[PDB]
Amino acid sequence: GSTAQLPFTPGGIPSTMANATKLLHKDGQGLFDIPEGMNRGIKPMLKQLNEID
Amino acid sequence: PDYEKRLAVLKDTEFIDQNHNVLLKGRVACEINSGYELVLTELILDNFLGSFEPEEIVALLSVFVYEGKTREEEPPIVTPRLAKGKQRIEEIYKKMLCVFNTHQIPLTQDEAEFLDRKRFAMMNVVYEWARGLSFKEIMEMSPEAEGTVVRVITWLDEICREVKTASIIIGNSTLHMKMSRAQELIKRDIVFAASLYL
Amino acid sequence: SKVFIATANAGKAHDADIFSVSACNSFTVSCSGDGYLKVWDNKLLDNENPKDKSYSHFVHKSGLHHVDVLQAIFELCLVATTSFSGDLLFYRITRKKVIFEKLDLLDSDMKKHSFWALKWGASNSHRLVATDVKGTTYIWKFHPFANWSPTLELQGTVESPMSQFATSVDISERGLIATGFNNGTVQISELSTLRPLYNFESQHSMINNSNSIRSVKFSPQGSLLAIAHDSNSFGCITLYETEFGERIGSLSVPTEFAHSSWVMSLSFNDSGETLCSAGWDGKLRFWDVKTKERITTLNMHCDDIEIEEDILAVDEHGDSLAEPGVFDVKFLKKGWRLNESLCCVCLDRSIRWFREAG
Amino acid sequence: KVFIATANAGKAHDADIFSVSACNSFTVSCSGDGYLKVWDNKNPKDKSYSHFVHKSGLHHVDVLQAELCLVATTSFSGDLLFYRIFEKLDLLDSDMKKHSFWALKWGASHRLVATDVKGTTYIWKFHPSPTLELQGTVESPMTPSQFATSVDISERGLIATGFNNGTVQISELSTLRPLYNFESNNSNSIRSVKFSPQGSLLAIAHDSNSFGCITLYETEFGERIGSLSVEFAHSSWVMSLSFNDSGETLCSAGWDGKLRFWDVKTKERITTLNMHLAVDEHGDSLAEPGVFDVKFLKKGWESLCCVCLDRSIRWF
Amino acid sequence: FVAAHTSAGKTVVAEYAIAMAHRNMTKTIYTSPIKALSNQKFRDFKETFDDVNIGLITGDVQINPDANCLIMTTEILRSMLYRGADLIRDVEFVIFDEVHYVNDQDRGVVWEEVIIMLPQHVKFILLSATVPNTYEFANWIGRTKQKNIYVISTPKRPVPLEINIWKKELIPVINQNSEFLEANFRKHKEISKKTWPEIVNYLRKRELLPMVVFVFSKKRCEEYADWLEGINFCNNKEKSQIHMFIEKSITRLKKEDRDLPQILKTRSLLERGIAVHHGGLLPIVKELIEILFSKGFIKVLFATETFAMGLNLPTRTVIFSSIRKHDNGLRELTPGEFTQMAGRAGRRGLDSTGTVIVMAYSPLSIATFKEVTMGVPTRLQSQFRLTYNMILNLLRIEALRVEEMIKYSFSENAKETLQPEH
Amino acid sequence: ELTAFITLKEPQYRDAAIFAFKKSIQLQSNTSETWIGLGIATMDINFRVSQHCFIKATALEPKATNTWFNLAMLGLKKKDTEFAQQVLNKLQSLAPQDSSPWLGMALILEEQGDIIGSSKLFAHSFILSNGRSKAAQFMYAKNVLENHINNGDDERDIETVEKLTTASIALEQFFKKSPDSQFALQCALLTLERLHHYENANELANRLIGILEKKFQDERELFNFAIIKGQFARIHLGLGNFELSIENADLSQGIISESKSMKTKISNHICLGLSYFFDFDQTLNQFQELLDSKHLVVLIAKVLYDVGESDTKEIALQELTEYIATSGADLLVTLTIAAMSILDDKREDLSIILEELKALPLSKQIIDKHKDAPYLIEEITKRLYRNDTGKQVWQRSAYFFPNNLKVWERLDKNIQRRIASNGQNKVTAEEMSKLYCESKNLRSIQRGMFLCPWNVTAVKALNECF
Amino acid sequence: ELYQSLKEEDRITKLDANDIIKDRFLRPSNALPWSLLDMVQDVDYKELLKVPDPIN
RNA sequence: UUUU
């Protein structure tokens, strides 16, 4: 095997879309602007209605 | 509580960040399955070993596989770069030990007594084995028995494999070539002779 | 394909350099520059000296450098060899001593050519291929019966693509012929038609003329071709794909090169998954064909000889033979000598046998 | 400390004089013409004698005295010949005579050390009916091997070998085991290695890219203690080194025709003697090619001897 | 889960599991924590089975990778599990051997992490020596993996043992029914370079050979072996056979390797029926000695603890030169270690009883003797430990929380008050 | 539709892709690949919507590393270097075995101005790719070519030749997938002309010339055509087709005769002169008279001397002496003058040449690895004096440089055979076979003939053995 | 011509200026060295991406 | 001063 592979799930040991993006900073006009784990977006130098769950 | 203290230690030395995500150093340390991942990662992470030879690297890496329990006095180092590597490893371990004792993590017998035992006493033997000397001279100069020397070299093979993988992760081609060359250099003769059961 | 154990050995086997070796189910045959042909019985016992089960025959005063053996089921066993003067000589082996019968199979007009390389093609009629110093390849069909009455029938010739020295030749089980030349060019032609198919050149550069093909081998499946060639004091191996004629890759190790000095011979195992190469630097290396990565390495010393009186540490001039170069290497099928086997010949006039663990 | 010219003899040899040596009675010098000349120590041309050894020339020579007087020399054919001062001896075996030898040194049981062209060092033991018996051998540290250019042996039992790639290996004489290993178009060939007569000090005549460097190491620890400079000691290659009886001053001969004397304790220069640093623009010495070898002579024979490119031998 | 004395027949269960998995056309994995038993197990299984393939996987070598039964160590299996090896797809049984084996300074005894990380379709066959702590670990495995575990424990021994004490006398102190005798102990209480010749002469006269002497010192083994000069145990035919075997075995080595001092000394002792086994030997020498002992050409052997865990040690007698062993200082032998070492003193079908002798050079106290010989067996302990590598790997595999894996480890007196979001 | 739009680069496919992606998202919004595709589709129109789509795709499927690379490349598209660097650092911490993060880091470093780190990262990306990326191969070949054009290298350097060979192999594999690429074809021609692979260069140059001819009315097109024609004339000159080389050189010179142009002019002059020399001496003389660097002068002097005229020889001597008096003293010019004087047999200058050759500085002796100065010194000494005092320079050379082969080639042949063996020196099969055959033994002659059966001397020696 | 001659104990074989100078110092070549080559030679972000795979 |  390799470290690029994931292990098979062990045995015995223990609104998904809505719960996935609950902590994403939604900017004005209703759109995500900051990736998770970061603190900024890109600074250059209909899509909102798509909330169909 | 031990898990929390180890998380604090891993975050302190920049292995993982405040969100408990694995950084580059932690990613490299994931490969090292031996007992000293942090010190080995700190050793091979920068360009310290960029002027060493494959024989010198494989000789220096023997500190991590030799228990260091011996009575005979250490002879002088056979190469100045080996002395430099000894000093670097000692200072890295002192810094790491201070960081460990800051967070009051209990230490095993081997981890606490690392710098007290003569753990650099097989660098000359491994060096001369990698140069091409036969087992007779090696035994005439070694401070241990045949089994200990065979065990040390056998474990050094796997250490070389792990360092090859870590170097592939880091992005150091020269280290990868040196480790492959050393692996081919030390794997020969009676030390790696095939078993009588095969 | 990862552990090899020495089995039997023989030192000072010949009076000069042992240039080639070949094997069949019954025995192993070797040639040398002293002009003798030696037969080593494959079916040995425990703790039996191989020099006790050996049979020699004098062939030519000039010396021999190529040999091949054909065994097929009436049981016929043929040996063909080439001498330094340029003759092609055929012998029939019969058994419990061993009898050598010289066969006159070539006509008068075919005895004026100087041959270098040769190879047997077994039926799956048997065929023989050979190369000329002028750069030509000859194709023969062997008919044993008309009652024993052997004849060699000429099928055709293949001319050189460019003329250069033809140094190596091989024939596959699917009906292909590969010829190597001294400038690094390899030609592949069809057996049933004698028409060339592919022509690829394997040179790293053409600044200097130190490129030369030393060995060409076909995979046991026949879908792959391996080439050993020089690169101005280095040894290189390149893999090609024979169905469409395209470069696959190269075998290399830190020492872009496969060996440190020169690659003399190549060999595939029974399944075609492992390749072995022999080097002038005194090493045998084993490679994985799919991953193109080195697996193992064997080292040759003059001190490997079991009998201490047959150890040749130095030659007649005083030069050291502590790590001698390997001339030729051969894989042996399972059951010839449980698992596969291996044989090689070196500069210290020794012949050595190995066994695969498992 | 000053030195005054004492005697001179021009056109001593027909070809280049490559090495010089002396004892309490005689001074010997070899050349490329195949002659070795013995000069009386008590003009010196009227007290000189010549003998023919080999037609290929000679490049090394040494003298052993202990009433015994023996001379060993090496030829450009790889030969190694002995003479009892002139009576040619036969001490080498038939199979050992097939080797090729480059450098030698008499280690005053007596010892003889020699190097080969393949990087191998041979150690013998002389037994006066004279015989030799091989004590052992030392192989090349590196693979592939290199040319073994220099060799020396100390009174305390140490052997130093220098190679053409810049590597110096220190090995013992009791057990023949290695002790140290230093690795100091460019050239880095080790031209000369010397042991201080008293103490623990090794001087190595290093090579730069057309420059001469001298570096000092100390034994029993293998630590570099510095280098002599005026970090180049000469404007051209440094050919040979020499200590005196006390061991406090070290004389160096260079390819620039100058003899610079140094102080061991202070690592500072003392005086310069010109046989006949300035660099024009590339690294070329402004001076002319000079000295091949130098040798101190102790009191009662202090003096020194010098062989130059001008085919003359000079005493001071 | 099987817990029984060694040589009671625990390998029959493993062989039946291998054959049963072969019938279903699935695979089996055999693991051990000692790297010197993989080769012995490989040879033994390849000799035992026909039409079933056997393979061996180690750090570098691979033998028959596409086999039916693969042999490795537990660290190799753990690395495979963490790296998602495709080999585990077809594995039906995993066999854990030498579960009771405990050693603090050995980072290769990791079998609880292996149990935690195994998939749902894999069943277990755990084998160990007799321990008083079986049900807790079996219950933890059953609860954690949600598999039905059955506990088989057997104290019966195929060959009974006797315990004796050696001045030119052999006084039996414990009979075959484990009944301590005090009259003979008191009689013993009433009553060097010449000890071992005398012991060997007495045993040869009584015909209780071969023997194994357990010495807890590498140098003392060789000193005692050298103190046996003048004694011989072989005739010309056996000496020739041993010479031929060694000559054929060391063929794989160079000439300078065959001339090593240990090989010369080992051959010199071996051609007389004597041998030494400890951890300071070259591996090939140890293999040669073990094979020659198995074939039956060796009558006297001096061995350390490295021989107690070995596979084939058929001996009529076992001798204890001492009861204390250095581990952090000199320490008396635990009852478990003594039981494990002394249980090898019987041969099934060739012996009627097992002889075990304790050497008294001044008498020995009764309290320590009874504690060492007749004592409560050592409990089964948990060797699970937290390492930076495991934490980093589990943080890299963002699908399994480290706290959850921590809370599912074994712990004596764990809190049964966990209500997850209840 | 997205694949078609990427390959053909036409607006009408982007709108169809957007339509299909929006309809699929309406039917089911739980899938991540749809958001990835929608982000890629609008990556050029509105970067905010693309960033939103990439972030949502990361949220839905967080074990996918292609979203992070897409977001980093989008950041690089709008010239935000630090954002891309942070994303690439995270990606490297997440998927080290991938080759895309290394390529992105190398691009950022190359833009910043670093050279060594950029080369190291490009090499790592190429090695990790294992033939699966065209961009990695192209970037690696371009980097290798950019580092070895005016770096002052010699053919004897093994590493440079191996780098060029690897670049050529990478470019062949690249051409198997994307032919008709002008920049890659130019780089391939530059590498092949330097590896002396003239037939492959001929084929690739024919393809490139056809492409440029089809593509053409402007000015830069004519200049690029002239440069390509100059290189193509060089390829014919190296291939042995002198007439075609002359024709191409004339055509290229015609269009750039009234103007980077200096290099083409020099190349055209060299090619025309060398083509005419191989035999109209008048045109060659005129073209070489039409023409520092120490190499053009040596080549011109060689050609003019080989012409065979007194005026040509005088011109060559005058030019060499002018270079010596202007730019100082060097080894090659002095050796050429010495060879010309020795061949012409001029006694007056021979003594001065011998003195100058014997008065060489040590630096020139270190540079001379072939030992030409001792050879010429011995030749002049033997011719002038008819004595045997010329071996002394060989003895001194063997003293100073004892590991060389040419010094021992004269003194002792056993030394030369032993020095060249076992890898102590790098030696080819022809030289080793010659060394073996010079032992006069039958075994050695057989071994040398085995190593090189096309060697005349080995066959002759074996025949003479009997 | 020599192999035809070959067609018809370690024995010892019986086998024993201006051209060299002309060939080594004054012979021009049509293959340009690297020095002359140095004197005369003159040296989309959406295509780096991966399009996702189809779904069945 | 066993074991790795």
Curated annotation (Swiss-Prot), chain C:
PANTHER family: SUPERKILLER COMPLEX PROTEIN 8, WD REPEAT-CONTAINING PROTEIN 61. WD repeats lie at residues 20-41, 66-95, 117-144, 168-190, 215-241, 265-288, 328-355. Pfam families: WD40. This is Antiviral protein SKI8. Gene3D superfamilies: YVTN repeat-like/Quinoprotein amine dehydrogenase. The gene is SKI8. GO terms for biological process: defense response to virus; mRNA catabolic process; nuclear-transcribed mRNA catabolic process; nuclear-transcribed mRNA catabolic process, 3'-5' exonucleolytic nonsense-mediated decay; nuclear-transcribed mRNA catabolic process, non-stop decay; protein-containing complex assembly; protein-DNA complex assembly; reciprocal meiotic recombination. SUPFAM superfamilies: WD40 repeat-like (SSF50978). It comes from the Eukaryota. Keywords: Antiviral defense, Chromosome, Cytoplasm, Meiosis, Nucleus, Repeat, WD repeat.
Swiss-Prot record, chain E:
It comes from Saccharomyces cerevisiae (strain ATCC 204508 / S288c) (Baker's yeast). A motif (DEVH box) lies at residues 97-100. One of its GO terms (cellular component) is Ski complex. It is found in: Cytoplasm. Keywords: Antiviral defense, ATP-binding, Cytoplasm, DNA-binding, Helicase, Hydrolase, Nucleotide-binding, Phosphoprotein, RNA-binding, Translation regulation. Component of the SKI complex composed of at least SKI2, SKI3 and SKI8. The SKI complex interacts with SKI7, which makes the link between the SKI complex and the exosome in order to perform mRNA degradation. Disulfide bonds: none annotated. It comes from the Eukaryota. The gene is SKI2. Residues 1-149 form the Helicase ATP-binding domain. GO terms for molecular function: ATP binding; ATP hydrolysis activity; DNA binding; mRNA binding; RNA helicase activity. Present with 5770 molecules/cell in log phase SD medium. Its main location: cytoplasm. The keyword ATP-binding applies. The keyword ATP-binding applies. One of its GO terms (biological process) is nuclear-transcribed mRNA catabolic process, non-stop decay. This is Antiviral helicase SKI2.
From Swiss-Prot, chain F:
TPR repeats lie at residues 1-31, 33-64, 266-293. It is found in: Cytoplasm; Nucleus. Component of the SKI complex involved in 3'-mRNA degradation pathway. Represses dsRNA virus propagation by specifically blocking translation of viral mRNAs, perhaps recognizing the absence of CAP or poly(A). Essential for cell growth only in the presence of M1 replicon. Present with 11900 molecules/cell in log phase SD medium. Belongs to the SKI3 family. Component of the SKI complex composed of at least SKI2, SKI3 and SKI8. The SKI complex interacts with SKI7, which makes the link between the SKI complex and the exosome in order to perform mRNA degradation. This is Superkiller protein 3. It comes from Saccharomyces cerevisiae (strain ATCC 204508 / S288c) (Baker's yeast). The gene is SKI3. The chain holds residues 955 to 1432 of 1432 of the full protein.
